[PDB]
Design a protein around this ligand. Sequence first.
Ligand SMILES: O=C(O)CCCCCCOc1c(Cl)cc(NC(=O)NC(=O)c2ccccc2Cl)cc1Cl
Ligand SMILES: O=C(O)CCCCCCOc1c(Cl)cc(NC(=O)NC(=O)c2ccccc2Cl)cc1Cl
Lengths: 816, 816
Amino acid sequence: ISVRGLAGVENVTELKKNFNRHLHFTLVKDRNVATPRDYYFALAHTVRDHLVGRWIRTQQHYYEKDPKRIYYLSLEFYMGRTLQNTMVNLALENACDEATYQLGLDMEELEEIEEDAGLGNGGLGRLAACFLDSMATLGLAAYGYGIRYEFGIFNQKICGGWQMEEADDWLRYGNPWEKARPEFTLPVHFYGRVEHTSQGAKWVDTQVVLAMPYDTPVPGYRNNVVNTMRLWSAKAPNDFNLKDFNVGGYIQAVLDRNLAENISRVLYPNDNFFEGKELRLKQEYFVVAATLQDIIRRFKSSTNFDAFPDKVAIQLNDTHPSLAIPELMRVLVDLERLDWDKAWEVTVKTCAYTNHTVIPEALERWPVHLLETLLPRHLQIIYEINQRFLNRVAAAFPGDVDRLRRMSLVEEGAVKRINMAHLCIAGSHAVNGVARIHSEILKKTIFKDFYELEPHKFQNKTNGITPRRWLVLCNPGLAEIIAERIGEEYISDLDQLRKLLSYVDDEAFIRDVAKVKQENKLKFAAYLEREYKVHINPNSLFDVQVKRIHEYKRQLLNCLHVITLYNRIKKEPNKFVVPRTVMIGGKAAPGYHMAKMIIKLITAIGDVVNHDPVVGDRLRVIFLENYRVSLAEKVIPAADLSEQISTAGTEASGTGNMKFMLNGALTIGTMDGANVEMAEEAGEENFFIFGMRVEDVDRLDQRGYNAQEYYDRIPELRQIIEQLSSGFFSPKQPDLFKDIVNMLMHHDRFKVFADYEEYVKCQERVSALYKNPREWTRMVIRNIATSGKFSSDRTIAQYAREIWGVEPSRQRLPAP
Amino acid sequence: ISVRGLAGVENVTELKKNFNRHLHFTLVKDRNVATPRDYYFALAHTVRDHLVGRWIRTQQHYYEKDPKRIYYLSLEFYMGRTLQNTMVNLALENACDEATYQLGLDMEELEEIEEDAGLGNGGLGRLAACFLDSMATLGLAAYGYGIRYEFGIFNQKICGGWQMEEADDWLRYGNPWEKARPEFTLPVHFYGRVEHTSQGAKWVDTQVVLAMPYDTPVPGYRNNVVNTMRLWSAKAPNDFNLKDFNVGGYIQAVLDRNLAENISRVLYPNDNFFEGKELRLKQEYFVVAATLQDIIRRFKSSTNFDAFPDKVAIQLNDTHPSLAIPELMRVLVDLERLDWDKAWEVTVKTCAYTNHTVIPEALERWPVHLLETLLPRHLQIIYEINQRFLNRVAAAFPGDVDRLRRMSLVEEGAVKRINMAHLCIAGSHAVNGVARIHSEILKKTIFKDFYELEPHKFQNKTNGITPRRWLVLCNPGLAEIIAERIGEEYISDLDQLRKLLSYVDDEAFIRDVAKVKQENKLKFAAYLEREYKVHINPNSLFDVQVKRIHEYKRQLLNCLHVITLYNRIKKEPNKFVVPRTVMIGGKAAPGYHMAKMIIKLITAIGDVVNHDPVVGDRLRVIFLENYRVSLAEKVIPAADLSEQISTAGTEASGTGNMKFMLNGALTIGTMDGANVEMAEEAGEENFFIFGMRVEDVDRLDQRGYNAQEYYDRIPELRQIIEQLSSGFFSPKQPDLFKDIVNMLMHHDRFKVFADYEEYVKCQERVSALYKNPREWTRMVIRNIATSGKFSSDRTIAQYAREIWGVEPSRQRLPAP
Ligand SMILES: O=C(O)CCCCCCOc1c(Cl)cc(NC(=O)NC(=O)c2ccccc2Cl)cc1Cl
Ligand SMILES: O=C(O)CCCCCCOc1c(Cl)cc(NC(=O)NC(=O)c2ccccc2Cl)cc1Cl
């Protein structure tokens, strides 16, 4: 079998008895009545057993050596399943495969039983998960801090072509990976008021909610390092949430506890969109308040807080955990009694902020009346921070009164708001973008004034993905043939993939690379009929666009191309065209009307196209249901063409693009986010770039975007729009897509029409190349061999050195 | 050490490594950071490991042999801690004691860490728990069915002498004894409406709530039998509780799931009192609906339901699970399509009902509009049952029109109600009382008309307690000296205690019995200062009354005696009186104003009495906080005098009385409930009986109870009442106890004054005997040696033979 580890005689035997120990003592079942779910748990407990020994010594190790600790705060950690990933990082995969085989079970069948830990929306949360893996693999004393939602991202269902949302009760049957830690439970305060006494302000009459931590192990890749991801759960105190007496009802008081505990109940399903709800703000303060107490308690052990920044680094994944800044000041000033200036120096030195987007609707601007009621003391601290900061600005730019209001953390107008992004820049010693072009846009546009004030704060850290889950785990076949030629060191040193460049003309390698992709497509095509049912052709080109549904991602632009292909076939039926299976998948936030309308359009197109006899098997339009991490692990390795077509300047970085490049797909996209660095790495000749560059978009905005012009000059485009308008795709409801057509024609913020012509022209070129298997595969080799820069191990090493001030190490911890 | 088992060489070694296995792999801790709570869990998992092997074979056994199954339905199971009880029934106590000792830990200290499973209010719920233990010990294929409340009976706190209630979050840190079983999850329906079609009625448009079962092991005493207690948890479906579309909010829909799940959130804290709230009715149907589906599924395996009653017996613990009758009919008739009459014959033959009280306010009378809305089909079935039953009555008593309305299940008046007790009698083949006198009262009074209609249904089954938890567990010292003389067979054959009668004159035994009681009192006196702090004298007579606070239990009568003792001391300070420490403990339902006023009176008396220098150590009044099962295990073995002073005819049976008799306390009480059979068993000369008999109470009611008469003729009583009235016990609030005085004088339903004189006269006699250690101990021996009849093994054997139709067996199951 492959390089999924050794299947040692002693270890396969040991594994089997432990599997049986758990099936008996843990699941209290006997072979006779054991369900595949029982078997999955017996294995999970058996595999988990192998890392507790290492988990304990890693933590004990950091206590003894006492290195600088890295705290990654995020309201999202899109982890996915954890059984296989643990086997991989522990080199247990083959031994486990063999052992379950001897026990007469199919390991792959059991793996499918594990529920995804979908505590994330998309890119932002998956990054945090890839980062955790890399920090462990690079031997960093890092902790992931977040919220333990009992309901993660909703499960998407398609009814009559429409998306239906349903609760993701991922804890229903239990989580074998987490470990509750009821000794470090902590109190978090809300509401109350501020009393200004003689020796300081006091936050008084607050409502208390407890934060209970749950630890999940994060194993490094084959180095015996197991870090921790600590997730907080909300718990109501038993006293006041019952003890605030004088009528109301005892029963009611108890039932009302589910009011303080609602804080960790569900994840907000918004991707790149801000919703100013109180529950969201509560979650944000909750994770911040509890995490900081835990961070300081650990430090107090390790009171001059001058050394605090030398032992602590806290990274802010977006502005979601931005209250960490005024909260750190509160504790230092109100509780520890440090002077403002010393406190601020410490705060700025330990905090760092990462920006993930530039769209305005994604920006966090919290109404002042909300902060005023829920966190009175924090609002005071924010005003004081703002006051001193603006004084700095005035001193630097004398008389520049407009600059002052532009830079304020407080925004005036309808209702006063607090710009959380301005708060983060002011209280952090480093601010970074997630891709070179996004980082430049931050300096030139959005945060230009701040860059002029303190240029040294702004940096770039291009995103990356973990080659463990995103290669070895999901594509063992590709990982194996690569290993046959260059060894296994590349798994933790992706740059070595470049060595594959010298096999670009190797006849055996070209055949192998092409064979694994074929086996991957056949397996996906099978899975499709198995779990979703209705056939596809594995010989066609697999055209896939999978990511959250957004107007800026332009799934709509993809739709226009699909309809074009269809119309051309209907025009010249007996003309040869390269067969394609275009798959589009992704979730739409529940309140995002337009995004939900786009899902219906995709399914509507499929209804027409998939049942037209003249089309035959030359074109199928499929909507991939419930796109999530586990589903991504299946489609990506099977894709031929990766769609990354966002309007230039809107996708900060993207990471799915990197996943496809590493797995043998060719990319068709715009010069946006990381797409630029990828084409720069592979060579533009090995990439399918099209459309407007950032500057063309700006030129168009100066002159003014008029979709009618495009509609007027392109007959094919006009024909499509008139098809949608007349009900060609919605017979029973002819005006069903009027909102889409209306928007495309009059309020398209992302100029879909502007890139239409260059997009279908470019798609013609990919079809031309696909007709030449050998050359397509050779270009594929050029992409894979050149994807090494996009490993999160490179990203993390850069954060470590340029922001945290710590040195990565690939040293194996002293055995388990 | 005692007879807590053998401390085998191989087993103490095995125990230790398993303790360490769990501390490492299960608790993921290392000796260095392990908290006593971690140690408690390591041990709990180690002990639990020893019964899973037996649990599996016991269940497998019942499947193979297929005996008649006994289903005990109760909304209450007052279990208490389970670590020690499991050790005892498995004969692991010494081995575990030795092993933890070698590991350098104190087993007793770890035991105190376990949280009580307080899923009961008092007598009714503790009975169910004693019964479960006995059914396992007698080798019966029995299952306990109930609700898994996440919050059991509230924890009682005394603030300023007042009771404060606080949420009992007993699952906070986890339950090592239960095992979730997510494969047998079941749907339960609510609301909806009834469609009458062509071939039957249909319950339609219902709201669905899921019932998830959790199994807890119930080990028999040293026979390798481990039965199951299955507790249901409410879970919201992920669909409709989200899928019923058309605006409302996605977040809100998810947060609203805690509406269907509130059904199993908290136990109603009412003891012998009915509260017609909808949530209560929902809990009642919930446990019934889920249990029945599970019972029928098991039977379908084992479709002629003629054999149903031959394989199934379901016992109703009070009327709480009474909906099992119309629910069984619904399934049989609506779903299985059996004719009414065949269905009714089956239902009556499998159901049996146990009555626990005769007070009217405890009787369940559900408003028809409530049943009409929540369970429309069940109301129809109840009307049909009533119709046919009354027809039976009319046929038997022609022209007796008043008898007809008296017997109806439907009560007319203000609002129509359904008398659940009448429902149970009609649909059950057996109805029993819980003590001989209570059973006679049922036939003569409350259910007289029903008895005349079907005399064969009415039986008696005097309650009992388990000698395992209520002797061996809580009083090993007494269990040991008994064993030294008559052996160990009495633990599962309590009648053998009679053999102790021949040692009544044994000088060594008298000294031993007296010594263990002294050691018990010293340990309790210590525990008092340890956890509650404020000294007591262990040489005094321990006068204790512990049970729920109720007007019928007459804690108030106890209070009058205490005040009398105090007043007499103040009158003749230098006169000798037998020292006493009177302890009163118990919880009051949160809405029970009078009961809460009584707790304040007790603490108020203590405030005066405990600080009067003239009194010295001759009299202390102590209120035992948070009385529960674990606290009962401590006080009872230390008590000298047991107070069972309810008004004759009000306490159905009582069980605390039996606990005290078995543990060396003498009893002062009225001829009520089981007190009558206890004095009859021990000989009235060895009991301190006083007050009115049932007949005297009735004579008084005919003539009319006038408390003033007593107040007028007894100066001591008058003096007490004037002390309460003038604020002698409440200086700052002189009229604080006006409600108590007002009630005592004008609306005393339980004639406290009527038994006052005979009560203090009798108390004088117990003090006289206490002055003679040797004779007190000899009388104590007469009680213990004669308590064997009160074992739940005797009660269960009777239920088995006279109601269920099964034969008990003390046969050891074929090893683990
Ligand atoms: O194995 C097959 O291939 C199916 C054989 C079906 C024929 C009857 C088998 O007899 C059995 C056997 Cl072998 C085992 C069991 N039961 C538990 O293992 N386990 C439990 O019941 C159990 C499960 C969880 C928690 C507590 C318990 Cl006690 C119950 C019965 Cl009835
Ligand atoms: O034992 C004493 O007497 C106290 C000794 C204090 C001095 C430092 C000891 O060094 C240690 C040692 Cl020995 C052990 C640990 N940690 C775990 O065992 N266990 C965990 O951290 C742990 C606990 C639950 C779930 C997951 C983990 Cl990783 C952590 C550290 Cl820092």
